[PDB]
Amino acid sequence: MGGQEHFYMETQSMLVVPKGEDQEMDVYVSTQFPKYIQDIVASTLKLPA
């Protein structure tokens, strides 16, 4: 049995905006799991959640 592409009509899309204070980050992303985006972004930036 072969695989399958999701073929969501909207491709992967995101906008990452730094606030300019206290290394705050706002992440606008087409995702199913905002908590996970928060974890991996904070970890990559060495920041608290």
């Binding site: 928060q38 974890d39 904070a42 608290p48 959640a49």
Partner: protein
Amino acid sequence: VEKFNAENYWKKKGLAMVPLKFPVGLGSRAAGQAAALVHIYLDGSVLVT
């Protein structure tokens, strides 16, 4: 200061002390209500507003 004013005609010193009772209150209970929102994230960090 009284000694200085007895010895100077075109220059005068002055001195005064006033007391303070500033009461604090808004006139109604509803006018003093307040609210907050606190999150604890799974890394232990906290967001308060």
